[PDB]
């Protein structure tokens, strides 16, 4: 039996857990925090931690990890099973890159179609969206858009581009509540993350939603995709069985059972989802470093900067 220390959605990691018991007798116990929290937890344990797997929706949070020395090494072979181009690596071969989660466009189709909608992200913090563009400035994922901005464009733009959403913008406390805005008629577009959408789509069937998606793509910073993998604890006492889970995670078996719970992109190719989320490849996701401590910081500040929050 394994334990693993869980920062992913509840139902995402219920998900793999029971239909990895179910093909292998192994037992997993599961415990949830927050990715950091539990990263941190693991440093200051050490050689005495009880965990055996970290599964993250974040793969930023393995690079503390991997260089304190805390990580095992996984199969080669397993790693190659989910590196599609622009699929972060672990220099050291010591975590692996398993699904995504993608900024996206919502809108209105009833009042914008695709011909009314931008070639960057950047141009929807202009004076044409004024009142008419939603965004949700307390948002994980809206932080990493911004430390993207930085890192792909420079702090000048992406400075210039919270200010004009700051002018032109339409506040939202949650993503849940911008996309329900966009179908309420509220606001005609939103800016939010793929899987609200997704799932709303499934819970009540795209033909009776107003709202669409749009992916800008063209590696463009709006087209971020945010990774989710797993690593095996170097303390672990239990290797085979821990590799052995990591392995059914990057297994079709285990994509499927993903997938299937949970609106992400699955990274091997031959895996289909049932949300009906387009091919990873087809998103033309930019390639970004992982964003440290320090990322986050700096984004927090440039949003101070530009008065918002």
């Known amino acids: 039996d394994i334990t693993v220390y869980n920062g992913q959605h509840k139902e995402a990691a219920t998900a793999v857990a029971k239909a990895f018991e179910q093909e292998t007798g192994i037992k997993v116990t ?175 069937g795209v033909e009776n939603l107003k709202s669409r998606l749009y992916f800008v793509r063209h590696q463009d910073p709006g087209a971020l995709v945010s990774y989710s993998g797993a690593a095996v604890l170097k303390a672990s006492k239990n290797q085979a069985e821990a590799q052995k889970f990591v392995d059914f995670l990057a297994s079709k078996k285990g994509q499927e059972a993903l997938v299937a719970a949970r609106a992400e992109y699955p990274l091997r190719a031959d895996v289909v989802s049932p949300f009906n989320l387009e091919p990873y490849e087809k998103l033309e996701a930019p390639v970004v470093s992982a964003t440290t401590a320090q990322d986050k910081e700096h984004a927090i500040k440039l949003i101070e900067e530009a008065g918002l929050k």
Do not use: C
């Open 30 to 204: 599961l415990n949830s925090g927050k990715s950091e929290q539990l990263a941190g937890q693991l440093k200051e344990e050490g050689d005495k931690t009880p965990a055996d797997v970290f599964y993250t929706e974040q793969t930023a949070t393995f690079a503390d990890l991997s260089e304190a020395g805390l990580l095992a090494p996984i199969s080669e072979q397993t790693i190659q099973q989910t590196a599609q181009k622009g699929v972060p690596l672990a220099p050291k071969k010591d975590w692996i890159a398993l699904s995504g989660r993608s900024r996206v466009v919502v809108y209105d189709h009833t009042k914008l179609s695709e011909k009314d909608m931008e070639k960057s992200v950047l141009d929807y913090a202009t004076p044409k969206w004024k009142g008419k563009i939603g965004y949700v400035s307390t948002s994980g994922a809206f932080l990493e858009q911004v430390v993207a901005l930085s890192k792909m464009k420079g702090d000048k733009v992406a400075l210039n581009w919270l200010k004009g959403l700051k002018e032109n913008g339409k506040l939202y406390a949650k993503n849940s509540v911008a996309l329900q805005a966009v179908e309420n008629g509220e606001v005609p577009a939103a800016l939010i993350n793929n899987y609200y959408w997704y799932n709303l789509a499934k819970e009540k």
